[PDB]
Paper text:
AtzH is the first DUF3225 family protein that has been shown to possess a catabolic function, likely decarboxylating the product of AtzEG-mediated deamination of 1-carboxybiuret as part of the cyanuric acid mineralization pathway. The data presented here imply that AtzH is a decarboxylating, 1,3-dicarboxyurea amidohydrolase. Size exclusion chromatography performed on AtzH after removal of the his-tag, suggested that the native protein had a molecular mass of ~ 29 kDa, consistent with a dimer (2 x 14,655 kDa).
X-ray diffraction data were collected for both. The arginine residues form an extensive hydrogen bonding network with the carbonyl oxygens of 1,3-dicarboxyurea.
Residue numbers in the entry:
A (entry chain B): 1 to 130
B (entry chain A): 3 to 97, 99 to 131
Write the structure that this text describes.
């Protein structure tokens, strides 16, 4: 039963390590790693801060041309949850070292594929902090 | 090796997603709460607030306004993984301003049925 298999420590460790790689790649604009970690499927999607992208080829195309400026941020809060052995969500709140009056949220859903853990869908947005 | 969009699973999840959307438009708070995973781990990144845990999400729904306006759906992507997991992602326009809404959910099949384990909604300005 899946609800007796929330945050199994070995699975949670695995997902957390890949999430850490993703965050480091994001801040250094390591596009190879950012693409590696997204599920290579037409179903994968990314709702970015400024665009909606459908399918791995569109997301990888977008990362190729995106500017490496104003990427740095501090993570304020993190919740990674795993379900059984093969599925997880990763959610963070962040603040960009630049833009002062907004707080950022990033959400991912991760799946264990035959090539390792991959992001199947993601969503990033910034909202006004009261 | 998770099987994608198995037909029974994909139909089931789609039917619960439709229940959720109809409850949003009618402000049927009981159904909106029923469909969220009853766990401290559940979270909801709303258009204007971040809520952590079922009790906070349910409290927020119960006390908010009958405001949630109708949407025109631009695109819907519902994907299932094996028998017990899914994602539901929609792009929408509120029938209001010129913003483009995005709503993302992840669903799990619990012992009480399909539930939302995490969700995120945001509105952005896209060029026309």
């Amino acid at each position: 039963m899946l609800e007796m298999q929330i945050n199994l420590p070995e699975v949670h460790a695995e997902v957390t390590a890949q999430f850490v790689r993703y965050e480091k790649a994001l801040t250094s604009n390591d596009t190879a790693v950012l693409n590696e970690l997204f599920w290579n499927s037409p179903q994968t999607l990314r709702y970015g801060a400024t665009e909606n992208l459908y399918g791995y080829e569109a997301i990888a195309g977008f990362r190729a041309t995106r500017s490496p400026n104003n990427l740095e941020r501090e993570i304020v809060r993190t919740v990674i949850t795993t379900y059984g052995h093969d599925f997880a969500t990763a959610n963070i709140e962040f603040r960009r070292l630049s833009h002062s009056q907004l707080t950022g949220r990033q959400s991912q859903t991760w799946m264990r594929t035959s090539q390792g853990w991959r992001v199947v869908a993601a969503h990033v947005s910034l909202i006004a902090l009261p």
